[PDB]
Every structure is written in structure tokens, then in C-alpha cells.
Amino acid sequence: ISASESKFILEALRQNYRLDGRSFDQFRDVEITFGKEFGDVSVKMGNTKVHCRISCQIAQPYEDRPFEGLFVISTEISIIEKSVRRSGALDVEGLCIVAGSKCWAVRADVHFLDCDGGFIDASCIAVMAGLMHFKKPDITVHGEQIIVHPVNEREPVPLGILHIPICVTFSFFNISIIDATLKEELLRDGVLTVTLNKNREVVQVSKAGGLPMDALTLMKCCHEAYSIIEKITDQILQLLKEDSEKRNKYAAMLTSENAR
Amino acid sequence: RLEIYSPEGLRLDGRRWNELRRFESSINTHPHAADGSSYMEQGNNKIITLVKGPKEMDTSKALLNVSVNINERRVLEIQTSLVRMFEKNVMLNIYPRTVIDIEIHVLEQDGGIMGSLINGITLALIDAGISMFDYISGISVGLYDTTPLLDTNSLEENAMSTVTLGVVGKSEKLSLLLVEDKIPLDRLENVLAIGIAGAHRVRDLMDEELRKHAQKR
Amino acid sequence: VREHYLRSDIPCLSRSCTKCPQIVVPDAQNELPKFILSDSPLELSAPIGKHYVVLDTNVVLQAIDLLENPNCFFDVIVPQIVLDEVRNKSYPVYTRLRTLCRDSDDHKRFIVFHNEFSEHTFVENDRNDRAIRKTCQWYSEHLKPYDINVVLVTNDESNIITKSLVQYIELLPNADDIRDSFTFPEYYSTARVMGGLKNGVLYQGNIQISEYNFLEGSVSLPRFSKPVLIVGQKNLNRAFNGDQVIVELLPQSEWKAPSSIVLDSEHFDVNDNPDIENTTVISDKQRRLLAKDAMIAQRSKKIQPTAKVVYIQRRSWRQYVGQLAPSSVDPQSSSTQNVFVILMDKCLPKVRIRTRRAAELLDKRIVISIDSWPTTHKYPLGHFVRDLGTIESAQAETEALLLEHDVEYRPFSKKVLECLPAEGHDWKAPTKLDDPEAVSKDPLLTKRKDLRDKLICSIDPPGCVDINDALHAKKLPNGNWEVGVHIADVTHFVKPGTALDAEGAARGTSVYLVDKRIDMLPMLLGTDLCSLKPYVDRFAFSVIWELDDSANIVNVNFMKSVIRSREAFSYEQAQLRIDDKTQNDELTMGMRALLKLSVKLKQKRLEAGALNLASPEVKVHMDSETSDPNEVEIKKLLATNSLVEEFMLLANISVARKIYDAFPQTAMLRRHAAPPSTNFEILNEMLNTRKNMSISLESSKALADSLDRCVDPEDPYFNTLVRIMSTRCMMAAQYFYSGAYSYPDFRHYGLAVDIYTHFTSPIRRYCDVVAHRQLAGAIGYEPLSLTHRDKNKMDMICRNINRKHRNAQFAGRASIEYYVGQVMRNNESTETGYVIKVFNNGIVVLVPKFGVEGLIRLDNLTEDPNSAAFDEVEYKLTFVPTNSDKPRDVYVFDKVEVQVRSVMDPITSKRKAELLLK
Numbered sequence A: 001i002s003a004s005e006s007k008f009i010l011e012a013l014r015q016n017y018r019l020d021g022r023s024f025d026q027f028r029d030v031e032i033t034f035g036k037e038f039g040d041v042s043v044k045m046g047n048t049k050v051h052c053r054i055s056c057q058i059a060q061p062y063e064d065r066p067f068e069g070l071f072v073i074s075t076e077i078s079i080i081e082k083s084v085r086r087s088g089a090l091d092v093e094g095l096c097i098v099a100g101s102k103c104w105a106v107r108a109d110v111h112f113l114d115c116d117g118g119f120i121d122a123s124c125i126a127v128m129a130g131l132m133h134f135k136k137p138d139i140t141v142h143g144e145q146i147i148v149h150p151v152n153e154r155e156p157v158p159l160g161i162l163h164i165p166i167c168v169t170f171s172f173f174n175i176s177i178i179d180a181t182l183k184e185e186l187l188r189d190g191v192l193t194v195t196l197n198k199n200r201e202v203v204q205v206s207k208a209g210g211l212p213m214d215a216l217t218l219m220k221c222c223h224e225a226y227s228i229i230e231k232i233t234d235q236i237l238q239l240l241k242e243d244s245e246k247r248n249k250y251a252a253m254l255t256s257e258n259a260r
Numbered sequence B: 001r002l003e004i005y006s007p008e009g010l011r012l013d014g015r016r017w018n019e020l021r022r023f024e025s026s027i028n029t030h031p032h033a034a035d036g037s038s039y040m041e042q043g044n045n046k047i048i049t050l051v052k053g054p055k056e057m058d059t060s061k062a063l064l065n066v067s068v069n070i071n072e073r074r075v076l077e078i079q080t081s082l083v084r085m086f087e088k089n090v091m092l093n094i095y096p097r098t099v100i101d102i103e104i105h106v107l108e109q110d111g112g113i114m115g116s117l118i119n120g121i122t123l124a125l126i127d128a129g130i131s132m133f134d135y136i137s138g139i140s141v142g143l144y145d146t147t148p149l150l151d152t153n154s155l156e157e158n159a160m161s162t163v164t165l166g167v168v169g170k171s172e173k174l175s176l177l178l179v180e181d182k183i184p185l186d187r188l189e190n191v192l193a194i195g196i197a198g199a200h201r202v203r204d205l206m207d208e209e210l211r212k213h214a215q216k217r
Numbered sequence C: 001v002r003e004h005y006l007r008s009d010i011p012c013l014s015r016s017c018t019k020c021p022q023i024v025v026p027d028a029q030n031e032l033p034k035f036i037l038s039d040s041p042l043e044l045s046a047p048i049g050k051h052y053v054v055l056d057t058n059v060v061l062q063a064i065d066l067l068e069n070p071n072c073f074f075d076v077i078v079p080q081i082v083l084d085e086v087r088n089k090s091y092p093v094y095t096r097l098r099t100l101c102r103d104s105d106d107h108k109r110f111i112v113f114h115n116e117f118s119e120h121t122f123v124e125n126d127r128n129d130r131a132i133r134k135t136c137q138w139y140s141e142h143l144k145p146y147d148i149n150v151v152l153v154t155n156d157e158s159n160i161i162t163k164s165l166v167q168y169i170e171l172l173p174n175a176d177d178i179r180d181s182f183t184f185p186e187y188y189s190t191a192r193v194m195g196g197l198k199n200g201v202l203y204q205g206n207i208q209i210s211e212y213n214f215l216e217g218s219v220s221l222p223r224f225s226k227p228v229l230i231v232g233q234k235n236l237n238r239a240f241n242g243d244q245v246i247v248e249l250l251p252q253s254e255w256k257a258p259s260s261i262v263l264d265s266e267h268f269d270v271n272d273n274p275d276i277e278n279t280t281v282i283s284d285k286q287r288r289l290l291a292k293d294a295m296i297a298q299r300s301k302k303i304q305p306t307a308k309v310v311y312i313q314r315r316s317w318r319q320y321v322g323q324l325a326p327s328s329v330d331p332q333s334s335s336t337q338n339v340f341v342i343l344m345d346k347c348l349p350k351v352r353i354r355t356r357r358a359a360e361l362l363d364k365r366i367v368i369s370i371d372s373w374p375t376t377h378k379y380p381l382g383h384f385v386r387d388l389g390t391i392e393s394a395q396a397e398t399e400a401l402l403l404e405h406d407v408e409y410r411p412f413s414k415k416v417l418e419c420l421p422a423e424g425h426d427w428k429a430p431t432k433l434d435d436p437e438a439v440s441k442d443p444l445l446t447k448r449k450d451l452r453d454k455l456i457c458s459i460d461p462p463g464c465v466d467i468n469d470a471l472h473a474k475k476l477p478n479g480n481w482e483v484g485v486h487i488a489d490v491t492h493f494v495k496p497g498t499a500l501d502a503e504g505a506a507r508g509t510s511v512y513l514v515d516k517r518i519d520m521l522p523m524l525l526g527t528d529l530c531s532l533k534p535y536v537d538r539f540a541f542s543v544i545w546e547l548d549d550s551a552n553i554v555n556v557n558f559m560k561s562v563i564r565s566r567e568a569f570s571y572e573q574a575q576l577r578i579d580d581k582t583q584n585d586e587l588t589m590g591m592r593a594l595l596k597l598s599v600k601l602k603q604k605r606l607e608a609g610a611l612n613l614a615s616p617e618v619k620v621h622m623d624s625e626t627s628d629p630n631e632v633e634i635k636k637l638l639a640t641n642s643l644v645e646e647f648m649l650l651a652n653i654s655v656a657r658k659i660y661d662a663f664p665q666t667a668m669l670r671r672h673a674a675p676p677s678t679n680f681e682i683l684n685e686m687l688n689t690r691k692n693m694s695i696s697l698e699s700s701k702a703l704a705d706s707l708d709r710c711v712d713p714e715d716p717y718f719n720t721l722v723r724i725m726s727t728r729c730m731m732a733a734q735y736f737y738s739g740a741y742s743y744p745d746f747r748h749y750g751l752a753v754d755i756y757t758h759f760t761s762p763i764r765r766y767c768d769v770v771a772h773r774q775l776a777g778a779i780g781y782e783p784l785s786l787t788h789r790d791k792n793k794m795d796m797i798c799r800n801i802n803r804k805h806r807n808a809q810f811a812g813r814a815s816i817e818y819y820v821g822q823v824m825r826n827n828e829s830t831e832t833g834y835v836i837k838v839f840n841n842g843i844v845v846l847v848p849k850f851g852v853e854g855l856i857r858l859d860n861l862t863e864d865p866n867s868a869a870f871d872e873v874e875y876k877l878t879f880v881p882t883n884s885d886k887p888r889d890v891y892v893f894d895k896v897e898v899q900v901r902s903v904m905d906p907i908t909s910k911r912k913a914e915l916l917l918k
């Protein structure tokens, strides 16, 4: 970034517009696309594009925690941490198969295609979209310690999800804006990243340095953020329902449990 | 099993909801090992903090380094959070061509180390004679049901969501806010209110010792 | 090492401290602490006079019941250190001691005094006795000014008034009302078990746990006429109901009669903590109960063979539904917690699980799985699987019923689609059977008969989604009557070796909840295509008889057909038509012909000793041979019900014969064993003692007749009650292939017929699917799938469908039991019950209207249990009702009145909606 282009972006925010048109409280239009396999999601945010892929395999539990399974994320450009586990979004106790000896290890490998900021934020949508769209093999665990499981023979089962946490990252100047672009991002003087779920709980907040921020300016951010998080939760949910419909053209005629 | 918060409002250690735990300090604990140094007990917490002062590499700035030892992920996290804070806070533009190495040793921990860590560092730096914008003081609050509990021991962090804040001087602006488990949005602000008051008290206690040690000679 | 801060904040809590209100600080919500203990406490004789009470830890553990009593402890101080020692020995009792404080009111009042946190009281072997002592001195000194004195009740200076519990109570005005206070045996080795098996000294069996005592179980064994009992924690040796078990008989010194007490996990050993990776406190309530049951055990005649479990051969374990024990959970703590889960099946023990979400799951109906139950743990260990939603949730309740009975509810496989007809709802019976395009698309059509001139109609309950069965009647030129049962040709649509068949086979039978129907087969078949809808051509399998004036069979023919039902009546609508003399057309005329013939067919079957199931209320406690789901409120029957029944019965009979004759190897059939006369012992002994009557067992006719004889001049309905009760003694009918049994074992006992099968209901049942294919083969319409000649495969089909049927009924009756429960709660309704069981600590009532049992527990029947009389010979419970003062006698067979209300249990912190006596 040249001294000019920086002066231009920064002055514009002192006025108070953003070069790409959107306002200070505006999250880029989020574009979710589901792939062939369950757990395969692609999220697009302006010029930011991320792909996540949920995978799953038997493992193993830790000696500490016999009654719960494992959840790993791995990111690889070509906060996110707390949220997912912290929320009880993914119920790891529901990933126990045999206490102490067998359980599910779940993975998300997140892969950044193009980055224009929104790394943390897009990452989190990607995992959560991935996590909710993914399905486990079906197992028979009669045998106490013997696990049977496949494949097309049985239809896969979803993971049970207790919240949908979403992050919103505020960049600050010396004045706050939501979902900075890369050029916006490079000139920022401070960062704050609020995670919430639609249930209205603050799943986690993170601020270390730089610009000292008021109690009220935190609150103001959490609200500006929440309003977004609804939209994105309603979006993620609709795009699943629309995906599920597309895969099950003829659900209507196939239900066993029919009401009287 | 315990009673985290009796209906008579008494906690496991007998404190009330808005009461800090014991907080004692020392400065210049290592006159030869360091340019500044602090020893600090906060409840059962116990930290030696040592700043090996401005020494011989940005020509515009000084470089800061926090190194924290317990007696892997969680550590590097704690570290890089504290470097971030005190990068804003120390006047690194007063000490060009230089390094400030902050070396911490945590002897014992029992809830709210991060907050404890902050106070220790702040003490070590004032002792170092290193200049900084304001005094950041640190503290944790936890949410028990509808009631905030103002200075969480380890048994308290386990049974409720915690919030750590680092506060800039007697002001209400937070250098650091770490909300670490779930808290309803409609209860966050009140929790922050208590953090800020307790943080201010910590500073007030910090100020006393700095007064005290100053009167020797 | 824990910190310890000392205070000056902590108040007396006496409503008469006048110094403490200036020690005091507002709480978080800026509210001054309310002072609790009274100005004027119970004044005893001096020294003592006006006093507060100070409880020792061991007093609480042993006497929490008496503390809860509304007539003795009015102002009580709980030293924090006593609260603590109590909470570590037993969290449930602690829970209960906190409730008392919390629920402090005009009648009774408890406080915690934090003796360990005050500067004044804190103290530095058992320090803790001196700890408690010093509280009393402080409160003595503190309170003197107001004439109030401390008493310390204990068990094991002085200058502090100190009394035992026995001694404290004796000082009371109303003193003499005084309800006053591990390892399993290892299973045998393999080699040992096998030894014992070879010598006949050990026996394989399926443990059924008794339905009102989870600590009593039985196992059926050929050697023995009555079920061999297995009694107590130890002898049960960690078995679960359902488990395959090896047993050993105990010496006769150990044999026992059926228990006279009721029990569950929620109400046994209620003081335990769960514990994962401890001296037990026995409640007095329980000592007293297991006393009385041992006292009854001493004297009873008719003891029966008892055994003990030495090995678990097959574990019945599955995913179980349950809800946490609030008493084991800290509701305001986000820590991970060892806790107890109470399962929904009352036969089961409770389960230890460790869970991060104890507090969140606390009013959820959850699912768990057992992981182990080793010798050195009093309870199995399990682990959380998932949360179905809240306990009031209703949709979470349906999901639980289905899960508990292993009934599959997911949608049909997408592989099923491809097997349904390409043209779905547009599917049409061909106009011309000899149409050539039709004949190429389906060559079997040539063999199909055309019965579209037959004036056919149907009769079912109202709100019938699927019409399986239809009927016609036409008078023949010669005097005889041609009669037809025409059934849904599901077998034309559901072919073997296909996803669709595999599914219905797996499912076995359709299932009916109150609010919900689990279909065996896709709706496209069951509700549309296969259903014999009015005014539409529909393929069918038809049994056409020629029947004489006496209802005898002059011949029979079986044929795949086309038909078109003229009308769909409900049973009432049919009754109406027939009783309407203005209508005298052919179809009506046939309908009336059906009824008259049907009445004879039943007489035939009654004179062969068939069971009279005329009362609809009796009909519910058996199978329904039409496959009709039960109503919640039992409707009265009409002639038409029997008309439909006897003809389905006849079709079933005639198909049974034909398909046996063609396939003696592997005919699909249904049998019903005569019960052992042992089943009736308790009934005739109840009938003699209470009613000067008895039921006769020479034969099913001898019995049927003897029921007719059971008539109470006092009460008309009693007779039907007896009937309802003798049915519980009956065996289950079971499906079977002909190869596994000999002919005279084919008997259906209750329907009183040599041979029988299920054939008239293929949409709702898989047995009829198999019998259709079989009949098809028997008449040479199409060769039988080799599957249905394969004895191995035909056993696996039978095992399955019997199971699925068993489970289907159990599912459906639990749904009704749950709705009747809400309806009486919602409508605050009063209903008429009859007593069918009397224990020492409860009775069981039948509610005729809904044909449902419930258990009224003793301490939900009286405010004082300890004065109750139980008589096991006279089948009599004597007690003092609540809201009343007079001793009451209740006996078996007594007409009572009953209702449902929300009771909160003092022991179980749960507030369920229990059944009470009006």
C-alpha cells in the first residue's frame, strides 16, 4: 500500500464511507455453496473465498476424557479455536461410542483460496456450515466393543448441534468497521472479535491491545454484531434446507412416522 | 463437592461477590538479575516477573518479548496476548535500537493467572523505570447464575463462565477483554462493571506498595 | 490448599437479633438478608424453655425424614461444618436439607450458620466436634437477651444443653407421635459354567423383572411349573431385564414367595452418591419397609423355587431413555459432574454417567448407553448419547416411546422408490383383463379373476387411513350363500429380494401411537394403491366360500382378483343401514346375511371352548385379529364389529389350511398355547377368599363357562373385571412356520381353532405378506419364492415379527398410558377405578374406561405410613387417608375413585404427575 492509497482509504473513513460502498456496520454478502459429499462447503465473502471439508474417523479418546470424542481444525492458506468447542456447538460427549476405548474424531481442514480479510470470520462460517451439513456413518455397536458401520447400506446420520456460533471481527482506527477488507485491515490500529449465537449468548470475545476501548463501545459492537449473526444463521439454515430438499426430491412419499 | 455460592452469599473461601482475594506485592526483588522485578501473590497465585531492561532490531522502536514459564498452546496464547497489550502500552518509541525482555515464572496458579500476570508485569515495568502510557491492571469476573463473582479462584473458573479484563488506569477503557466462556449478552455489561471496579482496586493496592517502597530512603 | 477468610458480616438469623442488623451487608441485588428463625420458638420445660435446635451431622444423615416432618422441628440451625460433612457423605440428603432452609415459612424454619467463616466461631483429631460445640456457645451467649436457648440434638462442659434424638423428642408436647429413626459375587468362569451346564446343575434363561419391584426377577425353566424367582441385589448379580442369564438354584431354606413390596431405582438406596474415576446411609423409611417384607416372608405358605445369577450369557443392553436425578446434580454449576440417570423403564436400575452438561440436561429427556457394571460398583456406568428435548416436550416423548421399543421411525429408504410403480397415484387397474399391452407388462393377469360385478363394500373404524379388507354377500340359486372376503393384494406390489420387501420385513408390522402411526409400507401403497377404496378398481386376493344355512363350508376358492368396492362404511354406518328397514336392496340384504351368518360362526367357536371377548374392555387386553389400533377412550362395540371379525377369522382359518396343505414344511401360521394352570393360582385364591368364587381349568371351555358363573349380585361389571384379569394369565400367541411344531400344537387356544394364520391385513403386518405369497403358490398362480421354503430364513422371519408385534403393542399401550395421564391432569378429571393388586406399600388400580393400570404408592395414600396394616391372605390394605382422620380398609376388587395431580416427592426432588385416590 502506497502512502497515497493509504491516505485515501484513511481519509474516507474519517468522513465516513468505505471504498467498496458498504457502511461501517456492514458484513460482506456471504455466499455458501455445498458440494457433492456431506461436509463439503465453500464460503465466499467479497473477494475472500474459503473451502472447508468435514471428515470423520474412529479413534482411541484421551485418557483424561473417556466419555467424549475429538474435534480438530486445521487451516492452510493457499479465536476460531474457542467458539466451536466453547459453544457446545459440537456435542463431543455425543461422539463417545465406547467409554474409554472407542469414539469419533471429527476434522475440518479449512483451505483459503483467496484472502481479502475475513480470515477468522469466514473460517468460522465455513466450519459451522460444514459441521451442520456433515453426516456420520451409521454404526452398530452391539457387541459392546465391536463396531459395525457402513455406508450406502444405511443412510448417514447428522451430528447434533446445540448452538451455531458466528464471529464478527471489528477493525478500529484513530471509529470501528465490520469485516475489514485486506487494505482496510492493513491500516487498522486495533482488532476485536465478538462471537455470538442466535440464542443471544456471547460465546467468546477477544481484544488484546491496541486501542483501549470503552465498556459501551464493546456493548455497541456486540449488538451491531448480533443483528448480523441472525441473518447468517437464517442463511446457513435455509441453504441446508434447500440442499436437503434437492437431494431428497421425493421425501414426502417416504416418511414412516406419519401423524394422525 | 462444594457450594460455589451459598444463598447466604458466601463462597468456598468465605468471600462475598464483590471482594478481591489477598493481594500482596514486592518490587526490586532481583536487584542484580534484572533492571526491574516484582513478586506477587494474588490469592494463591504466585509470580516472579523480571524485565531485563532496555538493552542491545527496529531502529524506529524497541522490541518487546514476554516469556512465561510454568513449574504449550495455552502458554504461547497467554504470551502473545501479553506482548500485544504491552506493545501498545510501553512507549517503545522512547527506546529505539533496543530490546525489553520480560521473563515471567509462575510458581503457583489458582484462577485468574492472566489477570495476575498483567499486574506482575505492570509492577516489574514501573520498577524497571520503563515508561508506559497508563498502568494496566488485570482481573477476572465469573458469572454465577444472575450474580457476578469478582475474583475467580480455580474452582470458580470450572463451574462458571469467566471474563478477564485488563484496565487502563483509573479509566474505564479496557486494554484487554477476554470473555472465555458463554455469557448472555443481556448480562455482559454488568459483569464488565464489576471487573472495572475490582481492577481499579487492584491498581489502588498496587499504588500503595509503590508509595511504601518509595519511602525507604 | 484452600483459602479461608474470616468475617464479621454473618448474622444470628434470629428474627430477634437486634445487633446483627448492623453487622449486615446488602447482597448482589441490594437486598438486606431476611432474618428467619422465630421470635417465639417451641417452649419446653426448663431449663430450656424457648429454644432453637442445632443439628449434628450424624443426626441429619440418619433422621432427615423426621426433620421433614411437619409436627416436630420448627427452628433449626445447621452449622456450615455439619452441612459440609453431610454433603460429602450424601449429596441427596444435603439437597433435602437445603430445601428445608429454602422453604422456610410460618410452620417450619431452617438456617445455615457459616460457623467456619466467622471470626467468632471458627476453630483451629476431631476438631469438628469442638467446631459445632463453639457454635452453640456463641448462639447461647448471642441469644440470652431474648430468652432463647440452644439445644444440641446428637447421637454419640457440659454447660451446653445436649440431647440424643430419642431424648429431644421425648421433651416435646406431642412427644409420643414417633416415627423415629459392598461387592457383587464374581460370575463363574467359562469352564465352571459349562461344567454346571453339562451336569444339569445350571440353567439358561431370560430374566423378566417383576413390574413393581425392580429387585425381584423371574426366569422360566422347563423343569419347574412356576417361574423360578431371583430376589435381591446380590442374587440378581447385575443382570438387566431381558438379559440371557445362567442361574443356580438356591437351597430351599432360601426359597421365597412373590414379594409383597413395590420398588424402583428412584426410591431404593436414595442416599447414594454416584462415583466414577463411602459408608452407605440407609434411610429409616427403607429399614422399616425391608423389615415388613421379611416379616411377610417368614410366614407365607406357597413359597416357590428361587435361584441366583452366576453368569450373563447375553446382555440386553441397548440405548436407553432417561432423565437425570435432580438430587445428584448441582443445578447452578457448569463443572463436569458424576450424576445418576433414572431410565424410563421402571424395571431397570439407575445409571452413573459423568457429564460436562449436568445442569443443562437437568429437565431433558436424554438417551444413554451402558458401558459396564463391574463387581465393585453398586450401579452400572453409562454415558450420555443425546438429548431428545424437554420432559414436557411431547414430541420428545413420542421419540422416547419409539426408541424404548426399538420401533424404527426414519423415512423409508430411497431404494424403496424404484420398487413402487413408475406411475404412482396415476396407477390404474386395467379395464380389460385380456388387454394385450397390459398382458405383456404383466403376464400373471391371465390368471386373475374379475369380481367387479360382486357387490362388495367395506367396514372399518372411522378415521381409517387404510382399507385392507372388504366383503360381499349374494344369495345363490340353490339356497346357499356365496360369501367373500377380499384382501389388499399387497404381494402384487411388494416383491421379494427388494429394498421395499426388506423394509416391511424388517419393520414387521405397522405401529400406532395415540398421535402417530409408523407405517410398515410406503403410503403410496397403504393409503392409496393397495387400499380397497370405494368406487375404484383395485387388485385383491379373494377368499370366496359357499356357506350353508348353518354357516358350514360347502366349498372354498382362492383367487387373485380385480374388484371395486361399492361403499366404505364405518361400523356405525353399517349398523345403521342394516337396522334401517326402509332399505332392502341387494347389498344391504347381503350385509344382513353377513351378520346372521357371523353370529353362527361365533357360536360354533364358543361351543368349541373359544374365549368370550365380547366386552370391548376385555378385547383390549388381547391381540386384535383385524390389526385395528386401540382407541384411547374405549368405544362400545356393535353387531358390525363381530360381523367383520368372524369373517376375517374365517378367511384366516381357510387360508391357514390351504397354505399348510401345500407347504407342510414352512407354512406361515399363528398358534396360541394353553396356559399352565399355575398362572391362575393367585386369581382363584383371590376369588375364593374375597368373592366365594373360582375359575376352572380342565379346558378352555371349562374356563369360559366358569367365567359366566363369576357374577357379583352386588356389582354387574365385576364379571367383566374378572375376565380382564384372567386374560393377563393367558399366554401370548406367536407366529411360527409349520416345520417347527406338530399339528396338535398348531391350536389357537383362545379362538379355539385347530389351525390359524394372519392373512387379512398385509398393509399393516408382514406375516400376511408371507401368507399371501404362500397362498399364491398353493393355488398355482405363481411359484413361491424359495425364501419362503427356507426353514432357516422362515425362523428368522418368525422371530422377528413376533418381537416386532410384542414391541408394537407395548409401544402403543404406553402411548395411551401417557395420554390418559395428561388428560386426567389437564381436565383435573375424576374417574372410576378397580383394585387389582394390594401390596404392603401400595395398590394397583385399573381404570376400566381407558383400560390402564397405575400404582398408587403408600406415602401418596397417607400422611402416616408407619401405622398401616397389610394382610397377604385377605388381600387387604388398611390405612389412614390424607385429608381425613378415619382408618380405611381397601381390598382387591374394590370399586374406587381415582384422579391425577402433580405431587413433588421429598426424597426425589422431581415433581411428576402421580395417580391418587379420590
Ligand SMILES: [Cl-]
Binding pocket: B029, B030, B031, B032, B033, B034
Ligand atoms: Cl538479584
